């Protein structure tokens, strides 16, 4: 800014930048899909685990 001697636009774009400073807001969208996915996955994982462990001892 101290480079520009025509400064009356650096204050403008500074204020515009600081205005739109939360340019994009927070996202956690993996919290409904991750838990649902975890349930189906967990169910299947434990089933497989128990099955093959059982077979090993058999």
């Amino acid at each position: 800014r101290s480079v520009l001697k025509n400064t009356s636009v650096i204050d403008k774009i500074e204020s515009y930048v600081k205005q739109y400073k939360p340019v994009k807001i927070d996202a956690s969208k993996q919290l409904q899909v991750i838990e649902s996915f975890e349930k189906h996955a967990m169910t299947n994982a434990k089933e497989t685990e128990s099955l093959v462990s059982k077979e090993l001892k058999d």
Binding site: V3, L4, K5, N6
Partner: protein
């Protein structure tokens, strides 16, 4: 910034052609006569210092 620097070069060149106009004004004046005397006495001082 880029245009600011360009504008500075342009201003300098505007004032350059204005300087040519002032040079023509100076050579118009009988300062053209009076400064010959100034050169003369200055050279007298210079050449005596030799």
């Amino acid at each position: 910034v880029r245009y600011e620097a360009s504008l500075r070069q342009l201003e300098q060149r505007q004032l350059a052609k204005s300087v040519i106009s002032r040079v023509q004004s100076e050579l118009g004046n009988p300062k053209f006569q009076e400064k010959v005397l100034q050169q003369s006495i200055s050279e007298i001082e210079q050449l005596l210092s030799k």
